[PDB]
Copies of this chain bind each other. A is one copy, B any other.
Amino acid sequence: PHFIVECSDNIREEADLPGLFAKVNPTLAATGIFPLAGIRSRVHWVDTWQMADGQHDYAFVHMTLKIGAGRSLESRQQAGEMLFELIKTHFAALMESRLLALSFEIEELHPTLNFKQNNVHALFK
């Protein structure tokens, strides 16, 4: 699965992305639907943005979990809530001290137009 994050760089230090990944990876693997050698978490920092009217110090974090097609809505609905909870908890200190917007979405890769070649599965398995 692909866990992609976009984060305004005004919160880059405090967001602690390494620490969220450190938690996210294992949490998804633990569900048993997702293989740990397949989990790929990364962030794209943003230096130029405009949230709302740009009149305050606004910060945002947008997250996408792209997964293989086939899991049931129910199974996705539940891994989502579970992961949203973890995310919420990771950013709680921040949400209480500054203006912050959190958004998380789950999408599926194309059922057949999907290609992969990954040698780390060998390490695990």
Interface positions of A (Cβ within 8 A of B): 2, 4, 6, 8, 17-18, 21-22, 24-26, 36-54, 56, 58, 60, 62, 73, 76-77, 80-81, 84, 87-88, 91, 95, 99-107, 109-110, 112-120, 123-124
Q: Are A115 and B120 closer than 8 Å at their CB atoms?
A: no
Q: Tell me the interface secondary structure of chain A in the complex.
A: mixed
Q: Are A49 and B42 closer than 8 Å at their CB atoms?
A: yes
Can you name 30 A-B residue pairings with CB atoms under 8 Å?
Answer: A6-B42, A8-B42, A18-B50, A25-B53, A26-B53, A37-B101, A40-B49, A40-B103, A42-B46, A42-B48, A43-B48, A43-B49, A45-B47, A45-B48, A52-B120, A81-B115, A84-B115, A88-B117, A91-B117, A95-B117, A95-B119, A99-B120, A101-B117, A102-B116, A102-B117, A105-B109, A105-B113, A105-B115, A107-B110, A107-B113
Contact of A41 among B2, B4, B49, B95 (CB under 8 A): B49
